[PDB]
Write a protein that binds this DNA or RNA. Structure first.
Ligand SMILES: [Cl-]
Ligand SMILES: [Cl-]
Ligand SMILES: [Mg+2]
Ligand SMILES: [Mg+2]
Ligand code: NA
Ligand code: NA
Length: 332
DNA sequence: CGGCAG
DNA sequence: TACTG
DNA sequence: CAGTGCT
DNA sequence: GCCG
């Protein structure tokens, strides 16, 4: 399993012997991403991780092609950056890219919405404010534009997780709440706070979003809601905005999901990430005739598959033939 | 040639 | 994979 | 449904 | 973009 990142520790990227190469490829990858070339950007992402994890500085066209995640096209850009120190294509990125990046950083606006605004002639958030037709989400996103681009100290994430846990455990002391995402992976700063809630009795998790959200709204803790389907009663997730009380506090993104205990480990695995780690592991499950989601690890379906027993993260690693990784080692 | 997570 | 419209 | 966001 |  040298071809899968979920099989390796992410700490390999700590000693990156190719920054002068990857720093330029990241710029190309971002241009493709904001321009909508989802797959070309994905390939660039995997090559940047392969290069970041390689043991030595790359020096040879042959050496480069041998690396999984690097083919002929990528090799030639490498040999170009090594020989000449610069990469010519970086001076031929569409001039539209910076504006596209500006717009697609509005929460709720993606590549298709950005490309449309650009075609209609908008070039600044000012134009967007005053001429674009915005969705309820995009309007909130626009209003917290800077805040949603800002990361917070992991100490503030702990306060936010504690706020949620105290509210939830107030009306059911048996609830378990866990902070996931970059927080659980050990990062010093967190872009948002990802809270996982369940009840170990297998049933008391049902019908608690309503109680929890009202409790957290009665405190003024929640300032905006991005996604919160709370009419059908099948609510699985919540995405919104919060702010801790007092001076010098910023608006922070908050994601909550409630899960039945039977799905804890898979829910825990998905929410802890990283995202590329998840896509790698899930891609690995497919090859082994399995299917991994936030709900379960299961076998392929009948042209309804069996659900494999996964009481802990460890068991999901074991069933996929992978060495276990601490959450901090899944930071791909 | 087509998938690329679910 | 779960939302929105 | 297309588009978007979550990890 | 890369991969099988
Ligand atoms: Cl991979
Ligand atoms: Cl576990
Ligand atoms: Mg996060
Ligand atoms: Mg989140
Ligand atoms: Na290769
Ligand atoms: Na966006």
């Amino acid at each position: 399993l040298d071809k899968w990142v979920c099989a390796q520790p992410s700490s390999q990227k700590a000693t990156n012997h190719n920054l002068h190469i990857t720093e330029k490829l990241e710029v190309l990858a971002k241009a493709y991403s904001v321009q909508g070339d989802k797959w070309r950007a994905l390939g660039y992402a995997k090559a940047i991780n392969a290069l970041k994890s390689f043991h030595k500085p790359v020096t040879s066209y042959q050496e480069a092609c041998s690396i999984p995640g690097i083919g002929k096209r990528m090799a030639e850009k490498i040999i170009e950056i090594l020989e000449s120190g610069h990469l010519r294509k970086l001076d031929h990125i569409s001039e539209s890219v910076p504006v596209l990046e500006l717009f697609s950083n509005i929460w709720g606006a993606g590549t298709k919405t950005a490309q449309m605004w650009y075609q209609q002639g908008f070039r600044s958030l000012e134009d967007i404010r005053s001429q674009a037709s915005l969705t309820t989400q995009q309007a909130i996103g626009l209003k917290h534009y800077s805040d949603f681009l800002e990361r917070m100290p992991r100490e503030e994430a702990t306060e936010i997780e504690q706020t949620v846990q105290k509210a939830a455990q107030a009306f059911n002391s048996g609830l378990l709440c866990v902070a996931c995402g970059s927080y659980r992976r050990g990062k010093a700063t967190c872009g948002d706070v990802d809270v996982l809630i369940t009840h170990p009795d297998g049933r008391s998790h049902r019908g608690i979003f309503s109680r929890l959200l009202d409790s957290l709204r009665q405190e003024g803790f929640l300032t905006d809601d991005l996604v919160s389907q709370e009419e059908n009663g099948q609510q699985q997730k919540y995405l919104g905005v919060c702010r801790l009380p007092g001076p010098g506090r910023r608006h922070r993104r908050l994601d909550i999901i409630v899960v039945p205990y039977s799905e804890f480990a898979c829910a825990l695995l998905y929410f802890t990430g990283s995202a590329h780690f998840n896509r790698s592991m899930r891609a690995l499950a497919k090859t082994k005739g399995m299917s991994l989601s936030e709900h379960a690890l299961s076998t392929a379906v009948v042209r309804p598959g069996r659900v494999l027993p996964t009481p802990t993260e460890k068991d999901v690693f074991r069933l996929l033939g992978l060495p276990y990784r601490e959450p901090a080692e899944r930071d791909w």
